[PDB]
């Protein structure tokens, strides 16, 4: 399943030239620019809905190489990568997951490396009962394919 760009978004490119460090209130924080309007946005909040695509992770200062991911979870930022190879495979309901890639090793690792992911099927999954007290907590997904 490939989630798409929901609605009102704008595709921008990437250059270290748009991610500069500045000063807001009483602290040093990495600032975005958003080229189509030339603004500030000194925090990972309120950033306009973008579709930022990355061609190569070369000069990714591990600080600003992080700040993108931190902005994915607080502004609904839809990012991209193109130089990554993986051999993920379909998995059965029970037994579930085992190992999993870290959301930081998949941003600051050598270009050559080929790491594999692990995906879930969920069709023969056992469903809930009739009368039952509902349990809390939710399930999340962070890295989708686009092949298919």
């Amino acid at each position: 399943f490939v989630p798409d760009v929901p609605e009102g978004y704008v595709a921008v490119q990437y250059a270290h030239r748009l991610f500069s460090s500045s000063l807001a209130n009483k602290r040093n924080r990495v600032t975005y620019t958003h080229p189509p309007t030339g603004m500030a946005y000194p925090s990972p909040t309120g950033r306009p809905h973008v579709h930022m695509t990355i061609n190569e992770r070369a000069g990714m200062s591990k600080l600003v190489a992080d700040n993108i991911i931190a902005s994915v979870i607080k502004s609904n930022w839809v990012v991209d990568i193109h130089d990554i190879e993986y051999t993920a495979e379909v998995m059965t309901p029970s037994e579930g997951y085992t190992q999993h890639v870290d959301a930081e090793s998949i941003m600051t690792a050598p270009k050559g490396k080929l790491f594999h992911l692990q995906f879930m099927d969920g069709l023969l999954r056992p469903e809930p009962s009739a009368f039952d007290p509902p349990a809390s907590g939710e399930d999340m997904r962070l890295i989708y394919p686009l092949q298919p």
């Binding site: 270290h16 500069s20 460090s21 000063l23 040093n28 000069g59 200062s61 600003v64």
Partner: peptide, 8 residues
């Protein structure tokens, strides 16, 4: 080589 850090 790429340099980052102190505000320009």
């Amino acid at each position: 080589t790429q340099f980052h850090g102190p505000n320009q």
